[PDB]
Amino acid sequence: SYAHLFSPLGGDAGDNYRAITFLRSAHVPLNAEALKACGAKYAFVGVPFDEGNIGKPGSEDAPREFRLITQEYFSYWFEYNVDLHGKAVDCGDVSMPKVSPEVAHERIYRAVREVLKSGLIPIICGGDRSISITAARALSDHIGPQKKMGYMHFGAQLDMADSWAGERNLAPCAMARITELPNLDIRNVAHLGARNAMNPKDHIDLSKERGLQYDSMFDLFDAGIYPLVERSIDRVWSGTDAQYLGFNFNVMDSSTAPGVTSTEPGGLESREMMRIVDMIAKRGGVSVIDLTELCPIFDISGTAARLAACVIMRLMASLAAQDGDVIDDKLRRTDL
Amino acid sequence: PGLITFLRSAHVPLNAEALKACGAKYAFVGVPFDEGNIGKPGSEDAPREFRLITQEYFSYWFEYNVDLHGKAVDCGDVSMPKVSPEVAHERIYRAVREVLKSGLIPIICGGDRSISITAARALSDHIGPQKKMGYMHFGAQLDMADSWAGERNLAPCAMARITELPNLDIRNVAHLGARNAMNPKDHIDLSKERGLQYDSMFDLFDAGIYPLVERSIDRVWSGTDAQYLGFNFNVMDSSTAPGVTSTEPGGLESREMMRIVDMIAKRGGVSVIDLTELCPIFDISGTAARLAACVIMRLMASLAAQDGDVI
Amino acid sequence: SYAHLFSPLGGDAGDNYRAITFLRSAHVPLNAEALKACGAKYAFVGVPFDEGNIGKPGSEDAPREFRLITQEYFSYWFEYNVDLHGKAVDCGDVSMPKVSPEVAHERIYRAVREVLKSGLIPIICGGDRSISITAARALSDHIGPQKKMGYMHFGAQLDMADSWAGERNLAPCAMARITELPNLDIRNVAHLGARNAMNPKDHIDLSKERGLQYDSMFDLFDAGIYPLVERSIDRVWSGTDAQYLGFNFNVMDSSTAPGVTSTEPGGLESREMMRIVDMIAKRGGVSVIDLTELCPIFDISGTAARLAACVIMRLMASLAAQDGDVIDDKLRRTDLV
Amino acid sequence: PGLITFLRSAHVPLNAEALKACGAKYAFVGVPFDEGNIGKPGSEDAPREFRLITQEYFSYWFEYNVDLHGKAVDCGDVSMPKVSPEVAHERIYRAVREVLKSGLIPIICGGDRSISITAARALSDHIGPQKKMGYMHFGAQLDMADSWAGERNLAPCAMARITELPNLDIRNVAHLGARNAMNPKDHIDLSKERGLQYDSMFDLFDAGIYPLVERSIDRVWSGTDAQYLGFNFNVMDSSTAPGVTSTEPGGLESREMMRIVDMIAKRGGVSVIDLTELCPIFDISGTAARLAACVIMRLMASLAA
Amino acid sequence: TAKWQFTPHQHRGPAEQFGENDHIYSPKLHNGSFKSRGLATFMGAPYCPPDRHKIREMGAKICFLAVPWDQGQIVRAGASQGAAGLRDATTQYFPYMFEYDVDLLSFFRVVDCGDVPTVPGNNIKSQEYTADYVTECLEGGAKVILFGGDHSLPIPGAKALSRFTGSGKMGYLHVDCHLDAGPDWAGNLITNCSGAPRALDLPNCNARNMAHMGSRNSLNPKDWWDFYVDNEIRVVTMPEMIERGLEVCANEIFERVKKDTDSLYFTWDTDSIDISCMPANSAPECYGLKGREVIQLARIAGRHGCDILDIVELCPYFDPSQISVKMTVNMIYHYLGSRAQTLRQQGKQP
Amino acid sequence: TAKWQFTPHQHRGPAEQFGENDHIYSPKLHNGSFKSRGLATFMGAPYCPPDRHKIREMGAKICFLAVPWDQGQIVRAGASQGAAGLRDATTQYFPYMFEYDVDLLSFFRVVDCGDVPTVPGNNIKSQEYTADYVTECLEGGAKVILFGGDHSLPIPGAKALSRFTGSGKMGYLHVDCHLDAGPDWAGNLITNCSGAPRALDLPNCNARNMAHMGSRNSLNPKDWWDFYVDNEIRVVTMPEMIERGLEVCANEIFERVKKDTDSLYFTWDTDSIDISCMPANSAPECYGLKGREVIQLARIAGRHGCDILDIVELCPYFDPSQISVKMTVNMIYHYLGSRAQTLRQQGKQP
Ligand SMILES: [Mn+2]
Ligand SMILES: [Mn+2]
Ligand SMILES: [Mn+2]
Ligand SMILES: [Mn+2]
């Protein structure tokens, strides 16, 4: 069936595209056999967990809001001649009712391992940044000690606290734990967007001690943004067997993503990020995609959530185009 | 995990066989349709916000020793095209008929008050011309326009259409709460001409509320084979129902409606429940949506207690 | 001076009552010596802690909003002929930057014991309901094994979870911990306002098993509200040496208190609560006053916070009137200068 | 601990001796006065909201390797009566003189743009008739009403009063960002009659912004003994300054104002900083207040570097 | 000569309606302004400039005049936005009240006189403007509905009514959470906390025809209470209204403020209303009138009648709902519907 | 005979201003409507009913006509509230633009024609009304600014301009995040996603004079793209605008849609604007025009000129700020200021 490509027909075919799963995809249980059998390339996994956050509360509601906002779009991308229909499934949310944070993280880890076992690309929607520690560890364990991982994250905060209030796996520690993964060489790590007054000196110091070559927002401005992004893309993708890509949309200028846990004006514009998406998609693959720290209670007109969905879906569409996975442009609505 | 449903209930397709097999007594049906609305926009978002608000409540009603778990399922939203009202209404009609066919009670959440026209017609057709229907609606507006802007099935026409149903005797029709100036003279004239014995808010206050409510409950339930119960929460005082399409000062307070719900539940059954005109863009911290949820859930619990369906 | 009783004079005297401390009170450090010397009867203690909350977030910012809202009023109560000026001081907030929940509670405990040692009445503004566990433990320890405590709480939730996610001191556990205090007889415990669909069955079961004589919202309506409130006041105050009084303003109908962590319409009206405040003040004293679960991000026009401030300040004014602590009503603004 | 202060800074009484001894370079002064406002209400709440937003930021600025801890103190709000504008302005005047006496830089947060009239006069009086003042303001409105509704000290008169100060040569005055129709013809006429060389937004875009900003910086700082710098954040594009009294589309973006801050800081000093017309009731998730806070704090960090 | 004329359901052009009573019936050719306000006046009434000659030529017997001034305020600005919310909110109603069987628009020949202009920062001059605009309405033969704006409104409002009343006697009723009887505020005699003492100072307004209803809480400095004690002016606190009932108290006070009077000024602060019904206010207050009691008080006021009704301190920016603006519509409409029903029962003309 | 007359700074009564140029200067006796809107029309212009004879008698050369209809919408209602927000926001500006040295009100003799009435539930009849109201404006001798309302507006709008253009040729420019070229939507040919095919269907609107600018993202079913391919209508996507430059692209496109034409219909969806500057929209979209680019495009449009400008889908209830409504004021005002500057430069008359 191709009816989903086009304006709905009348009669019993009339319906309302916005009246819930990610991009209206089929629901598939978090089971590797089922995921392998459904034909999709991506599995959306909601992680409504915020116990790692030390800042403004609210990310727990982001997966539901993100799902809802994807109903506002069609699966077809005229800019790319690609159709995302059937390319993703929605695995629901990791179940974490009335459990300890250690148990919550165990469930996240098992969920991520299970999707990776299926061969599908997990799209992990938090939830707080701490989820990335667990999901990246799952990727690291999935590929094993003889393979190499690359990691790239966009965000205003480095999250390079060695410890926070006696704890070692809260959100502000996330990169400090991720860069300890044994098959993630620091030369294959990129972090883009760090801002003034969002990064304690100890975070800078630990980054320097470890050789983390983060690209601050000023670094990006000094370089004209794209040439430096391209160099960091090359470091993450060249020579690595798997790549983890994460987003905290506080990388964006505040007016372009108000509904996030923490923000400071002076970040990326949406037109800059959409160019970066194509540059990433040129490399022809990704192993895990995450998004964390959306904060719907602070959003207005769903701005940040719409931006997030448009970036994630554009990335999927641009990857399909780079793969030559395009639809027959001769298809017409009068065929139906 | 990850689906948002009424009271965290199971999703069941809008299919009579599935609904009869699932074991619930109520089927929640979302109707995000607002093209009958003549006032401020926003009720299309009500089914989602209502569902969300119900997620915050436990299903156990300790005062009734009742657990609402398993008593309802959620059929999702009626699928309807935009800018095609006649087709949208046909879709609503078919959905309500299918739930009624299962024997479950539809809980219909609009959307604008026009949907009641169709849902009431579905109940009327379901029971057939040899049976009698009763109808009770709470709201601040009579909605007795024979026509409005030359049109005949908009929200302000709803009662003018519903009271034309051939097996709904006007003596079995109640309308409670009318007040304030969104009630033009022809709505009163048509009510008098047809004998609609509405209980205005002033009349209710003058009577101490409950004795007059009881009299109108008796007219709707006594001698009828099926009863349709509908709410526009602007029947409530604005203070406790701000987020409605047309809020109205000087109405029922939350504890009063809760007492009325128990009076209705004494009758031991209802055939259709609707709620329309919730309007989340105007709400104050979800107060109107919470009031609606508490009224619906309390009616379910009180009906369960009346039936002896306790823990 | 008496100038604070009256509209401001002109010249150098002209100022703006609205332009932050509780009731524009002096700040006094959390130090028993200073508190005993400052002459006040109450010490306001903000507790911006929400790590015990499993529900909607927001209570951490309540103390600041509560202080802000009190700037909206004078210290004089014409209904009572009482002046609250100098009767309270503001001790600031308990400091809890980047610490474990256990350290936070330790700091809360230390703060409350320190105020109690000075002889002042703490007015503790949370923050989540869990802080009540610690504050009640402090009162229990302060009075000692030879004295008896009474406890009265208004709220829609019983908070009688024996444990929650394996934890024992989160907000939904608060009454389960408070009723284990060794000098708090269950017969001197009142809980008013419990609501359907906010109270799981095990919380009811545990209440029944322990003999917690809670007054549900239905019980209150069935009684005409006040006679039952009076019976519960009598149990809390008769025979006890110290009384703890706490509020979760979700006891109020949602229209009167929208900015709270969890609410369901069908609670008390403000005019009922103002009557209740005078009934409590008839007993002539209270040892601790707390308020928790205010949620400013959900408040509209500051409604819940204003209600809370009016209830608390009315209670202080009504207690003063009951003690005969009234001003000279012959004073006039023309006396000034 | 419970007292909300600009940048979590110490509170210091508005007293020259105390301010000189506390070790800070800046003194935050809240001015919740809005009785000169001719537009939508709301700026009276800005000093409180501004303080609150600054609580969210760390004091360390890694690109500058500067920590702002101890650089500022908070003097609280100026005490002013309502419905007595003349007395309120006298109170502002005395507060600004007292801070200037201490040698610290006042950071004055309104409140409405009328406050600038008085604060600028205080600076003018503080340096006295043998010294020269320079004045730079960013905003979408010229505020060049000789009178407005017959009154002479309302917000739209502010530049008409400030450019009458006797030791403020018009060649040492800059006004950047003017655009859109909240600029009636007499404001242009008076600017032309007086020689006010304002840099309109269209002028700025035509020049690539920064070269023109640099010329105006040079006019304000070169040869002057003291410099007053003021912001109405409606100079910014509406997208990044929604919560202001009179928001204006088509203005500076956040990264552009941040660059300009660095250009100003290159001159190594400023005598008074003001920010007026923040309007929290119109803000979107605090965006305008955050922009304002980031501009002020980046200015402090860049000056320290 | 000015003509009193309006379009039923507002819109002109090709789909204009012309029926002389079409405004009391469901709209026929279109939706009127129930969804989109268009260029609505208060009640859809004809606009008439505040000019005694134009008002008298139109035969108008009620003038709606907004006084949005909010810079005579000791609390916080915002009431300048009240009148726009009110006018918008009348599009949600018909001018016909079935509870009274009255067409308010044609019964009173209502006109919307627009807004009184303001001089920002200048409370003295802005109040001089208000008194002069109110005088045009009274001299035009109409009773007046004045919509604030802050509570400084009764100072020019009562002064204009007092001048118009001349050698007769004028009563003054003040309904408010706040006693509003500062002798001065920071030296200023004419802020929004001095309505009552400034009314007493008028040559024909006497303490025996003044009263205050609705007070509670601590935004009430001692001199505001002492004013009532020393002048022996009746004060009905909100707790007294609750204990005795609005009907008893309201009827008693109206009898008192109208006894042997030729005119009555009635000023009504929205803060009298419980904050649960009225969040959009400069200084909103719990422990007030519930919504049904507001409508009852408006009905009681309508039975007795006043010459000027003012309603003050509405701040719509503070309310994300429509409850506050629609409450103020009903204060006015129930007052007018009750007044018309009373006149008609008495065989009297407006 | 109708007279074109207005009061500078709006207020009549004792403090009315009368200077013939007072509306372009700081107000003199009072604050006008900068704080409190009063009874403001668009730009404070005279109201003129949409009637060709009245419009011509006033000499009006621009009619502002709101079309709040938002029930021809396939996304979500809300744009029925746009025109009220827009009119209110014009009180925050003078009608004088110093950037062009033009008094927009006097230059064009602007009038506010009120709103087109609607028939709820009946998209066919509501569009019939809109076309008839627009025809009165065109036949009265004015060019038109049409303010929605949903994006079904260009269907009756272009139909009325096409009718007026007769045997001549009409161009059609559509600026939007969304391609809006559904042949039908659920069988319906005239919803807000079909402006472009309904225009191409007009007998005197030809593909060579049609264009679409601003598109991006995936609310864009394939048939909407296929329409431009199958009819050889030029599409300039937002990424092309960014890459090549707004000025280069917009000038090429205005040259295209005006070439050998007698009139031009220009429809402009607020969603073309980046969501950071325009949250108040039925279908807001990232990756759009930034604020300075909106003004630049309005200026470019004004230099070339259109006969009808419509602006659609503004939903002010979704925005707690004034940014969206004030953006739509500036779209109109910069269009008119640039248009007047160009006419004056060419020695031509509106
Ligand atoms: Mn007052
Ligand atoms: Mn008051
Ligand atoms: Mn469109
Ligand atoms: Mn669009």
Numbering used by the authors:
A (entry chain E): 6 to 24, 28 to 344
B (entry chain D): 25 to 335
C (entry chain C): 6 to 24, 28 to 345
D (entry chain F): 25 to 329
E (entry chain B), F (entry chain A): 8 to 357
Give sentences from the paper.
Here, we characterize a Ni2+-dependent heterohexameric enzyme (MetCaCb) from the ureohydrolase superfamily, catalyzing the hydrolysis of metformin into guanylurea and dimethylamine. Either subunit alone is catalytically inactive, but together they work as an active enzyme highly specific for metformin. We also revealed the divergent functional evolution of the proteins from the ancient arginase family, in which MetCa retained a metal-containing catalytic subunit but MetCb evolved to be a pseudoenzyme as metal-free binding partner. Biochemical and structural studies demonstrated that the metformin hydrolase was a nickel metalloenzyme derived from the ancient arginase family.
The asymmetric unit (AU) of the P212121 crystal showed an uneven stoichiometry of the two subunits, which contained two MetCa (α subunit) and four MetCb (β subunit) molecules. The hexamer was composed as a centrosymmetric dimer of trimers in which a MetCa and two MetCb molecules were arranged in a head-to-tail manner. MetCa and MetCb share 34% identity in their amino acid sequences, whereas their overall architectures were found to be basically identical (rms deviation of 1.94 Å for 321 Cα atoms), and exhibited the canonical three-layer alpha-beta-alpha fold of the arginase protein superfamily. MetCa had an additional N-terminal loop (T8–G26, average B-factor of 25.7) contributing to the interaction with another MetCa subunit through a hydrophobic interface. In contrast, an extended C-terminal loop of MetCb was located on the MetCa-MetCb interface, and it also stabilized the N-terminal structure of MetCb that capped the substrate-binding cavity of MetCa. Although the corresponding regions in both MetCa and MetCb were folded in a similar conformation, only the active site of MetCa contained a bimetallic center coordinated by four Asp (D183, D187, D276 and D278) and two His (H158 and H185) residues. A glycerol molecule from the crystal buffer was bound in the active site of MetCa and coordinated to the two metal ions. In contrast, no electron density for metal ion was observed in the corresponding region of the subunit MetCb. This was likely due to the mutations in five of the six conserved metal ion coordinating residues in MetCb. An unexpected discovery from the crystal structure of the holoenzyme is that the active site cavity within the head domain of MetCa is capped by the tail domain of a MetCb subunit.
